[PDB]
């Protein structure tokens, strides 16, 4: 019951009882909160409730101190002082933004904007409040019971009436009942258990409701600039492969933290592994939110770093298959590759946090809490996709609001920028450079003359809210008959249901724009499917077309993005 005020640190016995996180609020701040919001329950050792028997007065503005006890206006003794007066609430040791975070439902973009523009202590309050709000929202969905199992990868389900049905995509990972986590894809549904089990008829599934721990560490530690490289010892014999990043690796040792904006295929992973070769004695912990992002760093390390000094940390509760070439769960290795949610409590000379656009302020704070480092490097791209905000339904979340690191990269600029894309044909590089990089992204490859665009709105159908465009898939099928080299293309769309229909009709491997992030393919066939804000999102658009090494076919719905594509137009 005794803590520090979550806005001005002034110690207090007061906590807000109406706040879902019950933050410690001081006398002067607690008052400013309760007088401005519907939040009136104040908590101490004992709550601020009318001590008189059978009285349900809990509002702190309607209460008084009757010597040492608390009473309402109807039960107070003559010698009683109001709890609320003179800009203070009676407490021991005797903000408009805090009120908005404390009371919002997290469905508006303006809520996330504030959660990033506010002070550092309010960013942590916003991050735990949001995550707890996101968790309690998991209880607000219906249960799915197994009616019949058709095969090892397909079954039928009975849904709970009254409670809404969750979207059947990769994003939502259910918990089977204790038969492990279970994913699904759209009455014939495709079941995918994270544990191979003979699905029982009668068994049911419920969403993974995890406990929101409190945040102690800031999203970003305070910046320190040094005159020399600190606690790190550079090589003189530096591989010419990594010579392009020498000045940036030196910048890394002369700052507490550094930001790196690496557009698609500009050398982010190469930069991260090369930092290990530049400071060969430094213990480095490689982290990211996803297992796929941690695995991509493991792949590059396997090629340049000694396999004996590496360890891939796998949480005992396995959710997907992982990188199996390093020693598993050896926390004391020089190189430790681990997802944020699985990080052990340890120290490092350098912490490298990759795919920074996918991180939330919650993850930024967890990393600062689980890892104590001499240097922190944040690598990613604010022009790529952020983490999904399941509660956000109104307004669009701009890149400067993804997290603290992205806010810095978009306002003051990144400390380091990888300006040459070595993956994409120049048609794609020139398009995304103008679209999201203010003409600063350069092409290393020449124009491939294999980048096509087709303006074809088609017909939009819906599998609930996930969209399908069968005519756009028809146009692709027609193109494939005339272009057999594209037989090896990966099909990409903004919708899982579009991808499910394309997988059956075209037989091409399928990927949503969001799941393709961090991956590359020689050929990519992209159908925009709709002209919604989701399918027209410039960050999603940038990720979609930058997956291609050689060629891309874009069947577009939006005139704007189609006209922006510096591709050869096709007819039919
Ligand atoms: Zn205060
Ligand atoms: Zn409150
Ligand atoms: Zn009373």
From Swiss-Prot:
Consequence recorded when altering residue 88 to H: In strain: Iota/B.1.526
Subcellular localization: Host endoplasmic reticulum-Golgi intermediate compartment
Domain named (+)RNA virus helicase C-terminal: residues: 419-572
Phenotype upon changing residue 348 to V: In strain: Theta/P.3
LRR repeat spans? 208-228
- Residues bound to a ribonucleoside 5'-triphosphate are 262-269
Reactions catalysed, as given in the entry = ATP + H2O = ADP + phosphate + H(+)
Binding residue positions for Zn(2+) 11: 5, 8, 26, 29
Summarize the impact of residue 372 to C. Answer: In strain: Omicron/BA.2, Omicron/BA.2.12.1, Omicron/BA.2.75, Omicron/BA.4, Omicron/BA.5, Omicron/BQ.1.1, Omicron/XBB.1.5, Omicron/EG.5.1
The CV ZBD domain sits at 1-105
Ranges for domain (+)RNA virus helicase ATP-binding: 237-418
| Residue sites binding Zn(2+) 13 per the record | 50, 55, 72, 75
Question: Mutating residue 77 to L has which effect?
Answer: In strain: Delta/B.1.617.2
What mutagenesis or variant effect is reported for residue 213 to I?
In strain: Omicron/BQ.1.1
Q: Where does Zn(2+) 12 bind?
A: 16, 19, 33, 39
The free-text function statement in the UniProt record for this protein reads: Plays a role in viral RNA synthesis. Multi-functional protein with a zinc-binding domain in N-terminus displaying RNA and DNA duplex-unwinding activities with 5' to 3' polarity. Activity of helicase is dependent on magnesium. Binds to host TBK1 and inhibits TBK1 phosphorylation; the interaction with TBK1 decreases IRF3 phosphorylation, which leads to reduced IFN-beta production.
Q: How does it assemble?
A: Interacts with nsp8 to form the replication-transcription complex (RTC): nsp12, nsp7, two subunits of nsp8, and up to two subunits of nsp13. Interacts with host TBK1; this interaction inhibits TBK1 phosphorylation and decreases by 75% IRF3 phosphorylation, which leads to reduced IFN-beta production.
Q: What is this protein called?
A: Helicase nsp13
- Which species does this protein come from? Severe acute respiratory syndrome coronavirus 2
Taxonomy of origin reads: Viruses, Riboviria, Orthornavirae, Pisuviricota, Pisoniviricetes
Gene label: rep
Full-length numbering of the shown residues: 5325 to 5916 of 7096
């Amino acid at each position: 019951a005794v803590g520090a005020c979550v806005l001005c640190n002034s110690q207090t016995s007061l906590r807000c009882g109406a706040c879902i996180r019950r933050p410690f609020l001081c006398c002067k701040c607690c008052y400013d909160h309760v007088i401005s919001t519907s939040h009136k329950l104040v908590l101490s050792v004992n709550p601020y409730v009318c001590n008189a028997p059978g009285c349900d007065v809990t509002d702190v503005t309607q209460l008084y101190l009757g010597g040492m006890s608390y009473y309402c206006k109807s039960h107070k003794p003559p010698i009683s002082f109001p709890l609320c007066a003179n800009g203070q609430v009676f407490g021991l040791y005797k903000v408009t933004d805090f009120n908005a975070i404390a009371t919002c439902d997290w469905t508006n973009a303006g809520d996330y904007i504030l959660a990033n523009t506010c002070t550092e202590r309010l960013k942590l309050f916003a991050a735990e409040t949001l995550k707890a709000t996101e968790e309690t929202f998991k209880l607000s969905y219906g249960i799915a019971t197994v009616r019949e199992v058709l095969s090892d990868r397909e079954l039928h389900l009975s849904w709970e009436v009254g409670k809404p049905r969750p979207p059947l995509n990769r994003n939502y990972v259910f918990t089977g009942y204790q038969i492990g986590e279970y994913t699904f894809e759209k009455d014939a549904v495709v079941y995918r258990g994270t544990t191979t089990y003979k699905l029982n008829v009668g068994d049911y599934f419920v969403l993974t409701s995890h406990t929101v721990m409190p945040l102690s560490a800031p999203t970003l530690v305070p910046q320190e600039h040094y005159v020399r490289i600190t606690g790190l010892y550079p090589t003189l014999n530096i591989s010419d492969e990594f010579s392009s990043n020498v000045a940036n690796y030196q910048k890394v040792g002369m700052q507490k933290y550094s930001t790196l904006q690496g557009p698609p295929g500009t050398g982010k992973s190469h930069f991260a592994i090369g930092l290990a070769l530049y400071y060969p004695s430094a213990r480095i912990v490689y982290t990211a939110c996803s297992h796929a992002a941690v695995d991509a760093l493991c792949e590059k390390a396997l090629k340049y770093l000694p396999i004996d000094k590496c360890s891939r940390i796998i949480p005992a509760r396995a959710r997907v298959e992982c990188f199996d070439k390093f020693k598993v769960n050896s926390t004391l290795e020089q190189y430790v590759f681990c997802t944020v949610n699985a990080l052990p409590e340890t120290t490092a000379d350098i912490v490298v946090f990759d795919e920074i656009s996918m991180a939330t302020n919650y993850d930024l704070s967890v990393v600062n809490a689980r890892l104590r480092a001499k240097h922190y490097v944040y690598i990613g791209d604010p022009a790529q996709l952020p983490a999904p905000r399941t509660l956000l339904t109104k307004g669009t979340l701009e890149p400067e609001y993804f997290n603290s690191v992205c806010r810095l990269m978009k306002t003051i600029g990144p400390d380091m920028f990888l300006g040459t894309c070595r993956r994409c044909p120049a048609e794609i590089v020139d398009t995304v450079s103008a679209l999201v990089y203010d003409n600063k992204l350069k092409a290393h490859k020449d124009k491939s003359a294999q980048c096509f665009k087709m303006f074809y709105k088609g017909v939009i159908t819906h599998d609930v809210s996930s969209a399908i465009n069968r005519p756009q898939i028809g146009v692709v099928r027609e193109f494939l008959t005339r272009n057999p080299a594209w037989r090896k293309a990966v099909f990409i769309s903004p919708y899982n249901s579009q991808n499910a229909v394309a997988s059956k009709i075209l037989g091409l491997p399928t990927q949503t724009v969001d799941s393709s992030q961090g991956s590359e393919y020689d050929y990519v066939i992209f159908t925009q499917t709709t002209e919604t804000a989701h399918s027209c999102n410039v960050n999603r658009f940038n990720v979609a077309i930058t997956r291609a090494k050689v060629g891309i076919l874009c069947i577009m719905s939006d005139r704007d993005l189609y006209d922006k594509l510096q591709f050869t137009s096709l007819e039919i």
